[PDB]
Paper text:
However, experimental characterisation of this aminotransferase in the current study clearly demonstrates high catalytic preference for Phe, Tyr and Trp instead for Hsp. Contrastingly in mArAT, residues Val86, Phe110, Leu112 and Phe246* form a hydrophobic substrate binding pocket which provides an energetically favourable environment for the specific binding of hydrophobic substrates such as Phe, Trp and the less polar Tyr.
We also report the experimentally determined structure of mArAT-aromatic amino acid complex. The binding of Phe and succinate in the active site of mArAT as observed in the crystal structures of mArAT-PLP-Phe and mArAT-PMP-succinate complexes revealed the molecular basis of substrate selectivity of mArAT. The two liganded structures are virtually identical (an rmsd of 0.28 Å over 305 Cα atom pairs). The carboxylate group of free-form of Phe is held in place through interactions with Asn157 and the PLP bound-form makes an additional interaction with Arg330. The N-terminal lid regulates the entry and binding of Phe by rearranging the side chains of Tyr15, along with Glu111, Leu112 and Arg322. A stretch of residues of the lid exhibit plasticity (Leu9 to Ala24, rmsd 2.9 Å over 16 aligned Cα pairs), by adopting different conformations in free- and Phe bound form. In the other monomer, the carboxylate group of ‘free’ Phe form H-bond with Arg322. The present structures clearly demonstrate the role of the “arginine switch” mechanism in the binding of the carboxylate group of Phe in which Arg322 moves away from the active site to allow the access of the bulky head group of Phe.
Residue numbers in the entry:
A (entry chain A), B (entry chain C): 1 to 353
The structure:
């Protein structure tokens, strides 16, 4: 006899990290490459003084700062904070979907959507992509009476691509207005080529749109775990009901506030990443690789059954990239010397095939 | 029209941030009063250098340190880590209970038990205490075909009491073996008078027992959010399947490992708390208050309908204590001069009744 656990746990699609290759160049986690600004370390140092005290559960000053950052139409009541946007992903399922309810998203997409939906006893509706891109028409066709939540990942992880900004608006307009739609905008700060949607305009115009963002990437605080959701006050209130209390640390909040104060400098750095992304993409395509147009801080290599081998051999060259089954490899765009090292590996590996 | 959210959210509380008055004495969150040791600050400071990188999702070094700390009977496979033990409480519900299922606990007890159970669509079976203590017999009598999880909070929050250590073993031996039992031991470090149960021994002897502990109180890291569970490897594996990835921060892991290195010093400090707890209890009893025997870092005042008034008047005197409905007030034992300020207020308040 053992402790009886839920049958849903059986072969639950777990998030598995990449194995650590000591000293390897880290192109597997979509991290930016710079340590904290002086003002961010100072805020962290000051917050370290009171590590014996619980954080502000309501993240009051952080919400105020976020609403200010967001603009005049946004107040603290429109903002929920979570322990990474990954926590907010689960909170969205928890406020919308239970047993038998359906959650729709393009697939392949963020690897945590399926397990988080399954943990709730809900049914993941995984809609195939075309041109490695969310197919909004196919997703809409997939809606039923049991649909309680839709995830639009934009840019998409792991395929790197974006939908058209007006297409997104038409999609939102077409979805029954009582179904919550979450636009996961983890890489929104890297979009260029006039493809960035009117994210805030959409939440202003639609009560059922919620936008998710993160401090982990462009704002460089992946280690400290701060994400936020922007939406209608009733949606925000619900997210905070299921929020596990105190999960956003005091150091996290302090660092996040200091980072918003330095947004202009931090956002400006994304230009350099975009330039390197364009260069890495061009050189890969020149060497014979196929990949879609990226609007994030990584590219997607649909290598199929060669995925495992690519990633194993990269690891032999002290380079860590992220495999996805037998679909493809996601490679983060990092510092120029690091990207060149990846490129030398890629060209050699290609020639050998 | 608004987004349709789960109706079960009506069973969950909204918290609303109360006043944050400068100079108020903080006796409402069960916190210890000392800031970080030099070695803990150093761990935090060094992990800050790489805040742009994600944490170790598997908390490998922290689990190894916990397994050491636990001794030769326990390996990393017996340990799950969570973003505070509050996160692990939810994870326990997620591996055991869904719609229709029953979760048993004493009541009044940890304020998070009911909402976390409601979130899963499960039903909380709230069993009345006897003399402000868990009634283990009454709890056993409430067990049914639908019972998937039992919480025993020991010491109990908010009533401060423990069950007999031998009685706890008898109860565990008597519970049907397929039912997971969680022993919440957030205040275990404060138990004295021969009342500490053989917590680890219960884990070793029963596949269905899990123990929850925290770095928030005795180890003084409430701000950083690290809890842990000790259990059978298959239960631990399950907890880690529903674990929200990267929620335990890099700074949190670094700080916890360093605190474990300083366990002797940190644990030695609990003796002073216990001395204050006894003094506070005696002084309250001389003033005419009746309270049960505490084994935590707080005392419980069963003031019934007078609790709201007590707490409000304390707040006017710049003292923060925690109300629990019309049941009672939980008062943290902290620095002697804070405790004296509280006692002066309590004495005045009582003589005014
Ligand atoms: C599309 C998308 N949404 C959310 C998140 C989570 O970011 P957070 O704000 O929680 O740091 C990501 C991030 N993806 C990375 C890292 C990761 C984090 C949690 C779980 C799995 C992976 C990745 O490697 O996929 C994202 O892309
Ligand atoms: C304080 C407390 C905890 C610990 O919470 P953390 O999330 O570890 O800070 C757990 N359980 C109970 C009943 C408590 O009172
Ligand atoms: N989350 C509640 C209750 C709580 C207190 C302490 C720990 C966990 C939960 C609060 O704001 O205080």
């Amino acid at each position: 006899v053992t402790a009886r656990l839920r049958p849903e746990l059986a072969g639950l699609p777990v998030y598995v990290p990449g194995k650590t290759v000591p000293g390897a160049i880290k192109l597997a986690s979509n991290e930016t490459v710079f340590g904290p600004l002086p003002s961010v370390r100072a805020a962290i140092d000051r917050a370290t003084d009171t590590v014996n005290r619980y954080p502000d559960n309501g993240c009051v000053q952080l919400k105020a700062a976020l609403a200010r950052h967001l603009g005049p139409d946004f107040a603290p009541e429109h903002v929920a904070v979570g322990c990474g946007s990954v926590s907010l992903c689960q909170q969205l399922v928890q406020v919308t979907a239970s047993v038998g309810d359906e959650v729709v998203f393009g697939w392949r997409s963020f690897e945590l959507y399926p397990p988080q939906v399954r943990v709730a006893g809900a049914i993941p509706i995984q809609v195939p992509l075309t041109d490695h891109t969310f197919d909004l028409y196919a997703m809409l066709a997939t809606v039923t009476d049991r649909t309680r939540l839709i995830f639009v990942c934009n840019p998409n992880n792991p395929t790197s691509t974006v939908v058209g900004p007006d297409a997104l608006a038409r999609f939102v307009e077409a979805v029954p207005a009582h179904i919550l739609i979450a636009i996961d905008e983890a890489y929104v700060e890297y979009i260029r080529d006039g493809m960035r949607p009117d994210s805030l305009g959409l939440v202003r115009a639609h009560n059922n749109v919620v936008v998710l963002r993160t401090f982990s990437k462009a704002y460089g605080l992946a280690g400290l775990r701060i994400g936020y959701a922007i939406g209608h006050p009733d949606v925000i209130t619900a997210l905070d009901k299921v929020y596990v209390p105190f999960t956003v640390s005091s150091i996290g909040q302090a660092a996040a506030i200091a980072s918003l104060d330095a947004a202009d400098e931090l956002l400006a750095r994304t230009d350099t990443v975009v330039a390197e992304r364009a260069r890495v993409s061009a050189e890969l395509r020149a060497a014979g690789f196929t990949l879609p147009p990226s609007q994030a801080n990584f590219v997607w290599l649909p290598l199929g059954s060669r995925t495992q081998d690519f990633v194993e051999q990269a690891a032999d060259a002290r380079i860590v990239v992220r495999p996805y089954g037998t679909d493809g490899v996601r490679v983060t765009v990092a510092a120029p010397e690091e990207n060149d090292a990846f490129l030398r590996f890629a060209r050699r590996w290609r020639s050998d095939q």
